[PDB]
Ligand SMILES: Nc1nc2c(ncn2[C@@H]2O[C@H](COP(=O)(O)OP(=O)(O)NP(=O)(O)O)[C@@H](O)[C@H]2O)c(=O)[nH]1
């Protein structure tokens with residue numbers, strides 16, 4: 001059927017795996033096990049279309065990011081994730097986007113900016129800051145919590161809707 005290849009990128013510990021696992025398995029992963037490279041596949045109906053999501057969950061740790069490049073090359077849309085309590089992860093976003101443009105050899109790549117951990121109150125990235133960054137990229141900004149499930153489906157489905165506009 002119609003298959004969408006999604007890739008989740010961002011700094012170590014921002015919740016890439018927890019987000020993907022909440023989407024696919026409907027539970028919250030409380031522990032922190034750094035990822036090398038994992039993939040997930042699930043059939044879902046999105047806006048009346050039965051489709052297959054193939055999701056690549058990438059490493060945020062430099063030491064585990066061995067050869068992310070070749071795996072990412074086939075991605076059709078990218079979730080760029082930072083955590084709203086981690087200013088450094090937000091500052092790193094521009095570098096992740098540049099990496100995506102390098103592996104796709106294009107400046108026209110479907111992406112969504114995601115501010116995760118919105119259940120936490122120690123916020124150092126304000127919504128408007130992230131809205132401004134997304135605006136400069138021509139993409140949407142969405143906040144999520146892998147813990148409460150707020151916005152999780154919205155984030156991934158919005159990315160599918162972005163792929164459909166390209
Ligand atoms: N409160 C809260 N904690 C979260 C949220 N998302 C992830 N976490 C927590 O943050 C930690 C790291 O999550 P994880 O998904 O492993 O992060 P990652 O981005 O995949 N890390 P890596 O790049 O090393 O693979 C875990 O303890 C997890 O429970 C969230 O939305 N809210």
Ligand SMILES: [Ca+2]
Pocket residue numbers: 027028029030
């Ligand atoms: Ca749990």
Ligand SMILES: [Ca+2]
Pocket residue numbers: 101102103104105
């Ligand atoms: Ca290239």
Ligand SMILES: [Mg+2]
Pocket residue numbers: 016017018033034035057058059
């Ligand atoms: Mg992970």
Ligand SMILES: [Mg+2]
Pocket residue numbers: 124
């Ligand atoms: Mg400030």
